[PDB]
C-alpha cells in the first residue's frame, strides 16, 4: 500500500460517513486506544496512526530537522489525512498531539470537523504572566536525565535513568513515557515540546475544540482549559472529569471513555 501508511502504521477500522482520527501522545503508540476503539467501530470509521517519533516506527525515518518543531507533526497529520481521503474528521488527541492537530486545522480547516483534546496545553513552560505548565527549573532535570541516557547509549553502555528517578512526583508521571523511545529521539522530541509556544496562534483556530481535563490535575493546571477557551478563535467547551494520571483513557477507562464518547457524539460544542 502507501508508504505513508506503512511508515505510520495506519489502520482503518469500522465504517460510516464520519471518520474519527485518534492521536496518541508522545511516548506511547496507537495501542493506547485499545479500550476506546471497540466503542467507536460500530458507528464511526476509525483511523489509528503512530506519529514518527513513536517507538513503533522506524527510527531511520525520524528526521531531526523536520521533527524539531510541531509543524512537522502537523504536516505529517495533513499528509496522512490526504492519503486516506479523510475530510471533516473528528480528531481525538492526547496531550501535545491535540496541539499538533490544532495547528493542522490552522493550515487546513477543511480536514477537521472538531477537536477533542485530553489534557492539552499551549505552552508547557510557565512564565511570569502565564501559569499553564511547569517551571523551566524542573523540566531542566528531565532534559538532563534524557541527555545522560543518550550519552550513555552513545558510548555503548546502558541508559539507566528513569522518570521514577525524578523527585517531583508529578514529573515522574508526566515524563514517564518520554523514556519509551530511542534516547536521541527522546531528547529531540522533549526539546520540541519544551520550546513549543502556541499562545500567539490560538486565535487562528476556528474549528470547535472540546477540552477534557482532570479534577485537580497535578500535571497540567486546570486553568489551561479556561485560557484555551478564552483564546480559541472558535467555539469551545471544557469538561473536568474525576480521573488522574497521564493516561486516563487507558488506566481509568470506565470514567474516561464515556466522556470522550459524549464529546465525540455531541456536535454543538
Amino acid at each position: 500500500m502507501s508508504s505513508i501508511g506503512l511508515a505510520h502504521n495506519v489502520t482503518i477500522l469500522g465504517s460510516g460517513e464520519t471518520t474519527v482520527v485518534l492521536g496518541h501522545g508522545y511516548g506511547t503508540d496507537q495501542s493506547v486506544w485499545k479500550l476506546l476503539v471497540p466503542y467507536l467501530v460500530d458507528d464511526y470509521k476509525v483511523l489509528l496512526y503512530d506519529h514518527m517519533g513513536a517507538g513503533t516506527t522506524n527510527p531511520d525515518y525520524f528526521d531531526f530537522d523536520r521533527y524539531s518543531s510541531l509543524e512537522g507533526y502537523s504536516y505529517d497529520l495533513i499528509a496522512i489525512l490526504e492519503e486516506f481521503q479523510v475530510s471533516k474528521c473528528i480528531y481525538v488527541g492526547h496531550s501535545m498531539s491535540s496541539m499538533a492537530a490544532a495547528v493542522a486545522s490552522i493550515f487546513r480547516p477543511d480536514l477537521f470537523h472538531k477537536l477533542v483534546m485530553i489534557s492539552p496545553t499551549p505552552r508547557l513552560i510557565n512564565t511570569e504572566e502565564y501559569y499553564g505548565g511547569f517551571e523551566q527549573k524542573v523540566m531542566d532535570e528531565t532534559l538532563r536525565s534524557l541527555d545522560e541516557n543518550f550519552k550513555s547509549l552513545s558510548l555503548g553502555t546502558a541508559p539507566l535513568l528513569l522518570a521514577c528517578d525524578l523527585e517531583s512526583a508529578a514529573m515522574q508521571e508526566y515524563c514517564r513515557t518520554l523514556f519509551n523511545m530511542r534516547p536521541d529521539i527522546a531528547c529531540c522530541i522533549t526539546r520540541m515540546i519544551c520550546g513549543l509556544d502556541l499562545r500567539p496562534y490560538l486565535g487562528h483556530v476556528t474549528v470547535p475544540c472540546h477540552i477534557i481535563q482532570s479534577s485537580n490535575d497535578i500535571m497540567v493546571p486546570v486553568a489551561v482549559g479556561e485560557y484555551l477557551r478564552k483564546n480559541l478563535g472558535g467555539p469551545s467547551v471544557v469538561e473536568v472529569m474525576p480521573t488522574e494520571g497521564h493516561l486516563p483513557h487507558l488506566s481509568m477507562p470506565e470514567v474516561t471513555i464515556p466522556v470522550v464518547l459524549r464529546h465525540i457524539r455531541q456536535d454543538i460544542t
Partner: protein
C-alpha cells in the same frame, strides 16, 4: 587411515550422532562429501526465518522427519491467510522442501493454516498444534480440529498442550470420525490455558472414543464447586475405556499455573481446602484397571485424604510404575513402628513428586527413603512439618541414586536448611531447586551439579545465595531464576541491584533463564508515589552484562490489568551489554526502537519475541509489536557480515 576414506555407511552413522544444530552447521562446511552426508542425515529441523521470504526456502533438507514451523517470524503470525488465494502455494512449497516429514509442529493461528499445511503429508504420524491467541469464532464446536481428520492417512499422536481452544472442541472433533480416534496412541490435552478443565462428561467422551490410547494427559476440572466437575466416575471411565494406558497425567488447570498463588492453598483466598470427589476405593479400582501403568500423575487442587491404601494397591497392581506425581494427596505415608505403608511400598519408583501433604512428617520422609530405595528424582512442595533432620536422613538413605532434588515452599526448609539437608548427596546431585528464603529461622564442593533452579519473592536480594551454601559449583552451566509477587504494594528497594553479579562465583555458568513474568506492577502509569515496572526491570537486570552468558530467556514483568509485558528502556539497555549472547529470547513484547538495541551484540544469532503466554497480543493495535519492525530487525540482523 583418513576419515574420508571410510565407507559412507559408517560415516552416515557418525553424522546421525551429531545432534547439536550448531555443530551440524559447522560440519556441513567441511567438504562436499560432508555437506552431502550432513544434509542426508539431518532429522530434526526448526525452521528459522520470516514469513515474507518463505519462498526462498532451502531444499537441501529432503530427509528431515521432524519439522517445526511454530517459530517462524513474526512469532504467532498466521502462516496462511485465507483472504489470499496465493496461500495455497505455501503448502506445495513446504511439501517440496520437506517431503519426508513424519512429525510436524505448526502454529495453528487460523483454520486455513491447518487445512493447507497439515494435509500436505498423508504419512504424518505426530502433530503438535500451538496457539496462544484467542480461539476464532466458528459455526460449531470441533470445526477447527475437524480439519485434522484426514480420510487418507493415520495420525498416531496429537499434542494440544499448547493449543488454546474450547474444552468441548476435542470431544466434538474426536466424535466425528471413530477411525481417527481409534488410530491415536497418544493424546496430550494438558493445556494450562484452559479457562476451565474438561468436565466429567467430556472426559468420558474422549476416553470412550479413543480405546487404543497409550498416553493420556488432560487438564481436568476437579473442583467440586462447579457443576460437571471430574470425579470418581471420570477416573473409573478412564480406567475402563483405555486399559492399555502407560502414561496417565491428570491435573487441575490451576495446578498447571506458572504463578504459585494460583495452586498453592496457602496463597489462595480460601480456595481449595475442600475434599475432592475422589475416594480410596475409586483409586483402588482405577489402579486395578491399569496394569501397564508406568507414569502416574494426579495433580489436584482439592484435598484427598486417606490415600495410603490406594497407593499400596498401586505397587501390587502396577509393576511397571516408575514415576509418581501427587498433588494434595494427604495421608500419603504415615508409618507405624517400622512398617512401611502408603507410597513407601512402591519400591520400583524412579521419580516421586509430592505437593501439599498436610499429614507428612519426618517419619514419612524416612519411610519413603527406605521403601523407595531406587528413587533417582525427588520433589517435595509445600509440606509444613518436614524439617532438616528428616530431609537429610532421607537424602543419606538414597545417597546412591538421588541426583535430582527439588525443595519448594516447605515452611521449615529455607535456602540454608535445604542446602544443609542435601549434604549427603552434595558430590552427586546434578539438578537442584531451592527457594531463596533467607529469613527461615534455625567436601563443600558440588562436584556434579550442572543445573540450579531458584524461586524468590519480588524485591528479595540474590546476594545471600553464596553464603547460603551454594559456593563452589565448578560444573554449573545453567541457572533458572523465577521471581513472583505483587510489587504494587512494595516501596523502592534500598539496594540498587538484585545481585546478578553474585553469579560470577560460578565459572562455567553460560545459560540463564530469568522468569519475571509473574511480577505484577504498573507498566506505563503508576498512580502516585508508586514505581512502575521499568524500575524493577532495572533492579533485576543490573550486572547481567558481567556474566559470560551465551543464552538468555527473559520474561518481562506484567501489568495484569492492562495485559502487557513490554520490555522497557533499562532492560533493553542492560541486555545490550551482554556481548557474548548467542541466543536471546524475550517472552513479551518490545517495539522497534528497543529491539534495534540488540544489533550492538556482535555474535547474536537467534533473537525472537515469543509471547507464548495466554492471551497473546491479538493484532498490531493491541501492543507495540509490529510485523514491519520484526522484518526490518531480522533483515538488519542477518545482514551483519
Amino acid at each position: 587411515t583418513a576419515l574420508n576414506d571410510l565407507p559412507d555407511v559408517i560415516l552416515s552413522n557418525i553424522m546421525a550422532g551429531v545432534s547439536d544444530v550448531r555443530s551440524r552447521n559447522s560440519a556441513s562446511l567441511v567438504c562436499h562429501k560432508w555437506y552431502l552426508l550432513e544434509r542426508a542425515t539431518r532429522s530434526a529441523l526448526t525452521l528459522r526465518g520470516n514469513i515474507r521470504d518463505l519462498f526462498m526456502l532451502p531444499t537441501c533438507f529432503q530427509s528431515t522427519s521432524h519439522l517445526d514451523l511454530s517459530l517462524i517470524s513474526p512469532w504467532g503470525h498466521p502462516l496462511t491467510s485465507a483472504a489470499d488465494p496465493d496461500s495455497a502455494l505455501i503448502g506445495h512449497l513446504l511439501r517440496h522442501a520437506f517431503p519426508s516429514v513424519t512429525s510436524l509442529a505448526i502454529y495453528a493461528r487460523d483454520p486455513s493454516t491447518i487445512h493447507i499445511v497439515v494435509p500436505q503429508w498423508p504419512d504424518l504420524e505426530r502433530l503438535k498444534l500451538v496457539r496462544w491467541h484467542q480461539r476464532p469464532q466458528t459455526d460449531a464446536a470441533g470445526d477447527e480440529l475437524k480439519l485434522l481428520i484426514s480420510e487418507c492417512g493415520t495420525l498416531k499422536s496429537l499434542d494440544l498442550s499448547s493449543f488454546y481452544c474450547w474444552t468441548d472442541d476435542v470431544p466434538a472433533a474426536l466424535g466425528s470420525c471413530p477411525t481417527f480416534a481409534a488410530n491415536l496412541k497418544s493424546l496430550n490435552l494438558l493445556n494450562s490455558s484452559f479457562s476451565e478443565g474438561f468436565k466429567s462428561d467430556e472426559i468420558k467422551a474422549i476416553t470412550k472414543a479413543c480405546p487404543n490410547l497409550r498416553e493420556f494427559r488432560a487438564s481436568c476440572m476437579f473442583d467440586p464447586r462447579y457443576i460437571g466437575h471430574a470425579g470418581d466416575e471420570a477416573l473409573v471411565s478412564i480406567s475402563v475405556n483405555c486399559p492399555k494406558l502407560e502414561i496417565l497425567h491428570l491435573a487441575d488447570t490451576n495446578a498447571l499455573s506458572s504463578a504459585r498463588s494460583d495452586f498453592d492453598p496457602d496463597e489462595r483466598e480460601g480456595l481449595g481446602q475442600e475434599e475432592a470427589k475422589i475416594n480410596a476405593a475409586t483409586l483402588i479400582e482405577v489402579f486395578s484397571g491399569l496394569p501397564l501403568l508406568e507414569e502416574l500423575a494426579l495433580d489436584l487442587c482439592n484435598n484427598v485424604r486417606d490415600s495410603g491404601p490406594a497407593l499400596e494397591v498401586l505397587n501390587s497392581k502396577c509393576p511397571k510404575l516408575k514415576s509418581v506425581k501427587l498433588g494434595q494427596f494427604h495421608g500419603i505415608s504415615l508409618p507405624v513402628e517400622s512398617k512401611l505403608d502408603g507410597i513407601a511400598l512402591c519400591q520400583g519408583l524412579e521419580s516421586l513428586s509430592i505437593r501439599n501433604v498436610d499429614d507428612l512428617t519426618d517419619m514419612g520422609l524416612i519411610a519413603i527413603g527406605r521403601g523407595c530405595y531406587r528413587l533417582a528424582k525427588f520433589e517435595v512442595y509445600g509440606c509444613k512439618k518436614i524439617t532438616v533432620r528428616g530431609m537429610r536422613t532421607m537424602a543419606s538413605l538414597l545417597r546412591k541414586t538421588l541426583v535430582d532434588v527439588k525443595i519448594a515452599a516447605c515452611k521449615k526448609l529455607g535456602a540454608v536448611q535445604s542446602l544443609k539437608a542435601l549434604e549427603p548427596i552434595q558430590d552427586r546431585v546434578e539438578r537442584l531447586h531451592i527457594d531463596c528464603d533467607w529469613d527461615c529461622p534455625d567436601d563443600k564442593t558440588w562436584a556434579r551439579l550442572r543445573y540450579v533452579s531458584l524461586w524468590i519473592f519480588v524485591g528479595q536480594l540474590l546476594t545471600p545465595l553464596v553464603a547460603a551454601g551454594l559456593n563452589d559449583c565448578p560444573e554449573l552451566e545453567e541457572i533458572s531464576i523465577k521471581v513472583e509477587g505483587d510489587c504494587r504494594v512494595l516501596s523502592r528497594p534500598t539496594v540498587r541491584e538484585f545481585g546478578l553479579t553474585t553469579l560470577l562465583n560460578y565459572p562455567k555458568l553460560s545459560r540463564m533463564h530469568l522468569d519475571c513474568g509473574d511480577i505484577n506492577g504498573y507498566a506505563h502509569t503508576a498512580p502516585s508515589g508508586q514505581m512502575d515496572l521499568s524500575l524493577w526491570e532495572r533492579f533485576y537486570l543490573i550486572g547481567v552484562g558481567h556474566l559470560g552468558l551465551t543464552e538468555l530467556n527473559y520474561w518481562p514483568p506484567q501489568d495484569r490489568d492492562v495485559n502487557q509485558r513490554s520490555l522497557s528502556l533499562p532492560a533493553a539497555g542492560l541486555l545490550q551489554e551482554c556481548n557474548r549472547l548467542r541466543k536471546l529470547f524475550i517472552h513479551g513484547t518490545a517495539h522497534e526502537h528497543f529491539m534495534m538495541f540488540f544489533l550492538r551484540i556482535e555474535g547474536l544469532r537467534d533473537v525472537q519475541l515469543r509471547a507464548d503466554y495466554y492471551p497473546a497480543p491479538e493484532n498490531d493495535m493491541s501492543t507495540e509489536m509490529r510485523a514491519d519492525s520484526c522484518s526490518r530487525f531480522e533483515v538488519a540482523l542477518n545482514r551483519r557480515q
